[PDB]
Amino acid sequence: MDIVISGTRVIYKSDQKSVNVRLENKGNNPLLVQSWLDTGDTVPFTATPPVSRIDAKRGQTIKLMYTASTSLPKDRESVFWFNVLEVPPLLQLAFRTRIKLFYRPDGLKGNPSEAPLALKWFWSGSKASLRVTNPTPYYVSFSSGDLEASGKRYPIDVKMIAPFSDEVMKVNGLNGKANSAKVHFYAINDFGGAIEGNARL
């Protein structure tokens, strides 16, 4: 992919009339580029310009705008996908990249960077897995995580966990519950940086 998005996620605070996302063409040829929002494969947003020509080594700011055509919840975050599809101007190959957009109503309890600490973790029985509960109004997203017991480490197939919900996450290479296990993880903050955390099962 020649088109690069500035940032690995977008935060859309509800009091903003719009939010900008920047695209850059790092490649050597110009590209036709489409930008849009969807729910992850209708959506109360526009992205403009929806189609642009971005020359080599030049860029384009995309304006994302909430339309309230549908009302989003005001008591929790909502997540969307910001998509970018490039194609060089017969038959032709093209490429698509997506990053998350979190719609964040103003005034939610607590802070999003603290939501990973608030997660509760449980063994999920029998093919080991964990049940994880998010008591907060924020998504929690991870870059990686693992379970450790008796000096052995087992990667977790981490998944994003929605506000006020449970998710089960698989533990790789572990048959069943281990004694005195601990979870360690790196969640992702608004700026794409790491939030380290841990929990004892």
Binding piece for Cl ion, criterion CB under 5 A, among 104-112, 133-141, 150-158, 169-177: 133-141
Smallest distance from Cl ion to CB 193, Å = 12
Smallest distance, Cl ion to C-beta of residue 116, A: 13
Q: What are phi and psi of 112, to 5 degrees?
A: -65, -30
Q: Which of 29, 26, 20 is nearest to 82 (CA)?
A: 20
- Provide, rounded to whole angstroms, the least separation between the CB of residue 93 and Cl ion: 26
In this complex, which beta carbon is closest to Cl ion, that of residue 123 or of residue 186? Answer: 186
Instruction: Select the span of 16-24, 126-134, 141-149, 175-183 touching Cl ion (CB under 5 A).
Output: 141-149
Contact 121, 130 (CB under 8 A): yes
Q: Among all residues, whose Cβ is closest to Cl ion?
A: 141
**25 sits near Cl ion (criterion: CB under 5 A):** no
Q: Pick the binder of Cl ion from 54, 141, 158, 185 (CB under 5 A).
A: 141
Q: What is the dihedral of CA 17, 65, 113, 189, to 10 degrees?
A: -130
* Site size toward Cl ion, by CB under 5 A: 1
35 binds Cl ion, rule: CB under 5 A: no
Edge-to-edge strand list for the sheet holding 31-38? 9-13, 95-104, 78-87, 31-38, 51-54
Minimum distance between the CB of residue 168 and Cl ion, rounded to whole angstroms? 19
Q: Could you give the angle at the alpha carbon of 60 between the alpha carbons of 56 and 61, nearest 5°?
A: 160
Taking the least distance from each CB to Cl ion, the nearer of 8 and 48 is 8
Q: Which stretch binds Cl ion (CB under 5 A): 60-68, 80-88, 108-116, 139-147?
A: 139-147
* Closest to 166 (Cα-Cα) out of 201, 133, 123, 199: 133
Can you tell me the distance from the alpha carbon of 144 to that of 193, in angstroms, rounded to the nearest whole number?
13
Q: Enter the DSSP assignment of 116.
A: H
Q: In this chain, which stretch among 60-68, 119-127, 129-137, 138-146 interacts with Cl ion, using CB under 5 A?
A: 138-146
Q: Would you tell me which residues interact with Cl ion (CB under 5 A)?
A: 141
